[PDB]
C-alpha cells in the first residue's frame with residue numbers, strides 16, 4: 060500500500076513517541092507510525108491528516124512501509140515491553156536495519172540488546188532522549204550509542220529534530236560511543252538533575268528557615284542569581300513556581316504541596332553504577348537519600364515531636380548571608396559535576412567507550428532540564444585537556460573553589476548550628492576537603508582490617524603486600 | 531574414613547580458625563582446601579588436635595560421618611559457586627551444607643530455592659569476629675529452612691561467642707533463605723560506618739589538636755572505658771601502640787592510606803538504594819574508601835587546590851570531649867540507619883527478622899560489639915514495630931544531650947578544612963529525620979512544572995496536578 064515509502068518509523072504512540080514522530084515529519088520526512096493498541100495510532104493519524112504520516116496496523120505492515128536500511132525508533136515502556144517489541148520486530152527485519160531505543164533505559168539492557176541483535180545483523184542504537192513531552196515535539200537533547208556506521212545514517216535526522224543550543228545553534232546531539240554509551244550518559248544527566256534539585260532545595264530551605272524570607276523575597280533572590288554565573292533553567296523554574304497562587308485555597312501552591320519526593324524507579328541508577336565502579340559520588344547519592352527520607356513523612360512528623368534541636372534567631376547580615384549561600388550553591392554544583400564527569404571517565408575506561416566529555420556538556424545546553432550557562436566552562440576544561448581527570452584541576456574551577464570555599468564553610472557552620480538539614484552542602488565541602496587531602500586516615504582503616512581480617516596492606520615506603528602480626 | 535563429626539572447606543584465616551574452634555569443642559574435624567599445601571600446614575602445625583587431612587573433595591566427603599555437616603569458608607562469588615557445584619554430587623540426602631562466607635544474599639536465595647527439594651539441607655550463615663572470633667567464638671547469623679537450622683543449632687551454640695552479660699550464645703535463627711547473609715551484610719555496613727567515624731576522630735585529634743599517636747592511643751583507651759566501649763574502639767587503641775616491624779616509628783604511619791573493600795559495604799548501600807531506605811552515613815563511608823583509592827589524584831590535587839591553614843587556639847580537653855560525644859552520637863546514627871534498612875528488607879523479603887535478637891547476638895564474637903546493644907534490644911522488646919531507634923527514650927536522651935557538641939565538632943572541622951563526610955552526614959540525617967517539613971515540596975513543584983509528575987497536598991487527600999501555563 061505504502062511499501063518502502065517511509066523514511067523513518069516510530070513504534071509507540073503514547074505522547075512521547077507521537078511527539079517524536081511529529082518532530083521527524085515536520086523536518087520534511089514521511090514517517091511510519093505504529094502502536095500495539097491500534098486506536099491510538101488511528102487517533103494520531105486522524106488528528107494530523109495533513110502530515111506525511113503512514114498509518115500502519117500490524118508490525119508486518121509497519122516494517123513493509125519503510126525504506127531500507129530501515130530506521131525504527133522504539134518509544135515503548137522500558138524493560139520487558141521493549142524486549143517484547145524487539146522480539147516481535149526481529150523476524151520481519153533485514154540485515155543492516157537499524158533499531159533505536161529512545162526510552163529511559165538502564166544501560167546494561169542496551170548493552171545486552173545490542174550484542175544479541177548484532178548476531179542477527181541488526182544494528183541497535185540506545186539513545187537517551189531528554190526534554191520530556193515538549194522536548195520530544197520541539198527539540199530534545201539526545202545521547203545515542205551503538206554501531207557508528209549505522210548511527211551515521213541516523214545522525215542527519217537526529218541533528219534536525221534535536222534542540223539547538225541558543226548560543227550557537229549547534230544541535231544537542233552527538234555520537235557517544237558503542238553499545239550502551241548513550242544510555243549511560245543519559246543516566247548521569249538524570250543523576251545530576253537529582254543533585255541540582257536538592258542543592259536548590261537546600262538554598263530555598265536556608266533562605267526560608269534561617270533568614271525568614273517570604274516566597275516573594277526568595278523569588279527575587281533566585282531571579283537575581285540567575286542573571287549571574289548560576290544562570291540555569293532549574294533556577295528559572297524555581298522562581299516561576301514561587302510566584303504561583305494555590306489553586307484550591309489561599310497563599311501559594313508550593314506551600315500546599317506535600318513534602319514527599321517522587322517515584323523511586325530509575326533515580327538510583329547513577330549512584331548504583333558509581334558503587335559498582337568504585338567511583339566517589341556522594342553528592343548525587345545524598346540527593347537520592349534526601350528524596351527517600353522525605354517519603355518517610357509519618358516517621359518525621361512523630362520524630363519532630365520527640366527529638367530536640369536548636370531554636371536560634373538569626374541576627375547577622377541578611378545580604379551578606381544571601382551572597383554566601385549563592386557561593387555555596389555554585390561551589391556545591393561544581394562538586395557534583397566534577398564527581399559526575401569523573402564517573403563518566405571511569406565508566407568510559409571500564410566499557411571502552413571514549414566518551415566525548417566536552418561534547419556531552421555542549422549537548423546539555425538545550426532540550427534538557429539541567430541546561431545552564433556554566434556547561435561552557437566544562438567544555439573549555441576538556442577542550443584544553445581531554446584527559447582531564449577531574450574538573451576541579453582546571454584553572455577556571457580552581458579559581459572558583461579558592462574564592463568560594465570560605466563562604467561554603469560559613470554557610471555550613473551557620474546551617475548546622477541552626478539545625479537546618481543540608482546533606483548536599485555538607486557533602487560538597489567534605490568531598491572538596493577529601494579530594495585535596497594528600498593523606499587521609501584510611502591508613503587506620505587498613506590497620507583495623509589487617510588486625511581483625513588479615514586483609515593485608517600496602518606501605519608508604521616500599522613496594523609489596525604486607526601483613527602485620529597484631530597478636 | 532567416616533571418623534569426622536564436622537568438615538571445613540577453605541583453610542585460610544577464617545576456615546582454619548573455625549576448624550580449630552570446632553575441634554576444641556571435643557570433635558574430630560575434617561579439613562580441606564583447594565591448595566593442598568595449606569591444609570598440610572595446619573595439619574602439621576596441629577598434630578595434637580583431632581583433625582583429618584584430606585586432599586580431594588571425594589576424600590573430604592568420605593571422611594565425614596552421615597548425616598554430614600560441611601561448612602564452607604571460601605572466597606565469595608565464583609569460588610564459592612564452583613566449590614558448591616563440585617560438592618553437591620558427592621553428597622547424600624540428609625547431609626547439611628553451610629555457606630559461612632560473605633556471600634551476596636541473592637546468591638543464597640537462589641541456592642536455597644534450587645536446593646529446596648534435593649534432600650540436602652542448606653544454611654547460608656554470616657560469621658563475624660574476625661580471625662580470633664573464628665577461633666574462640668564468632669557471632670553467627672544463619673538463615674534457611676527452620677528444620678535445617680535446628681540440625682546445626684547445637685554445634686553452632688557450642689562454637690559461638692557467649693555474651694558476657696548472660697552467657698547466651700551469639701547465634702540465632704535469622705529467617706528463611708538469604709536472611710542470615712543479609713543480616714551479616716548490614717552488620718558490615720554498620721562496621722564501615724563506625725570505622726570511618728573513628729578515622730575522622732583520629733584525623734581531628736591528629737591534624738587539628740596536633741596530638742601524637744601515644745596521646746591519641748590514651749584518648750581511645752579512656753573512651754573505651756565509658757559508653758563508647760566497643761570492639762572497634764578497643765582495636766584502635768591496640769593498633770596505635772604498635773611500632774613498625776620493618777623500620778622506625780609506628781606501623782599505622784607506614785600503612786598506605788588506600789582502603790580496600792570486599793563488597794559487603796557496597797552491597798549494603800545498593801540494597802538501601804533498591805529498598806528506598808535512606809542510608810547516607812554507611813554509603814558515605816563506602817565512598818570515603820573509594821576516594822582513598824584515588825591516591826595519585828589526591829596527591830596532584832593537594833598541590834593545586836587551596837584551603838584553610840588554621841591553628842587551633844582553643845581548649846584541647848573540652849574539644850576532645852566534644853569529639854567523644856559526637857562520635858557516640860554518630861555511631862548511634864549508623865546503627866539507627868542499619869536497623870531501619872533491616873526493617874524494610876524484612877518486609878520486602880518476608881523474613882520477619884528478629885531485630886532485638888540481632889542486637890543480642892552482636893554482644894560478643896562481633897566486630898560491631900557496642901555497649902548500647904542491650905538498649906537496642908530493650909527498644910525492640912518495648913515496641914516490636916519500632917520504626918527507628920531514634921524514637922526510643924534511651925536514644926532520645928543521648929541525642930538531646932549530645933547534639934550541641936556534634937554541631938560544634940562539625941563547625942570546627944569544616945572551618946579547619948579537615949574532611950568529615952560521616953560526621954556531617956550524621957547531623958544532616960538527625961536534622962532531616964526530625965524535620966516535620968522538608969524542602970521536597972519545592973522538588974515536587976519543579977517535577978510537576980517540568981514533567982506533570984503530580985503531587986499530594988498538605989491540606990487534603992488525593993493527587994493533584996497544577997496548571998502551570
Ligand SMILES: Nc1ncnc2c1ncn2[C@@H]1O[C@@H](COP(=O)(O)OP(=O)(O)O)[C@@H](O)[C@H]1OP(=O)(O)O
Nearest residue numbers: 071072073094095096099134135136137140143144
Ligand atoms: N507489553 C508491551 N508490549 C508492547 N508494547 C507495550 C507494552 N507495554 C507498553 N507498551 C507500549 O508502550 C507504552 C508507552 O510506554 P510508557 O509505559 O512509558 O507510557 P506512559 O508514559 O504513557 O505510561 C504504550 O505505547 C504501549 O502501547 P499501548 O498504547 O498499546 O499500551
Ligand SMILES: Nc1ncnc2c1ncn2[C@@H]1O[C@@H](COP(=O)(O)OP(=O)(O)O)[C@@H](O)[C@H]1OP(=O)(O)O
Nearest residue numbers: 540541542543563564565568603604605608609612
Ligand atoms: N577461584 C577459586 N576457586 C576455588 N576456590 C577458591 C578460589 N579462589 C579462592 N578460593 C579458596 O577460597 C579462599 C578463601 O580465602 P581468601 O581468598 O578470602 O583469603 P586468602 O587470600 O588468605 O586465601 C582460599 O581458601 C582459596 O583456596 P586456596 O588456598 O586454594 O586459594
Ligand SMILES: O=C(NO)[C@H](O)[C@H](O)COP(=O)(O)O
Nearest residue numbers: 512658659791792793794897
Ligand atoms: O566480614 C568480615 N569481617 O567482619 C570480613 O573481614 C570482611 O572482609 C570485612 O569487610 P571488608 O573486607 O569489605 O572491609
Ligand SMILES: [Cl-]
Nearest residue numbers: 205206237238
Ligand atoms: Cl556497538
Ligand SMILES: [Cl-]
Nearest residue numbers: 189190427428
Ligand atoms: Cl530533561
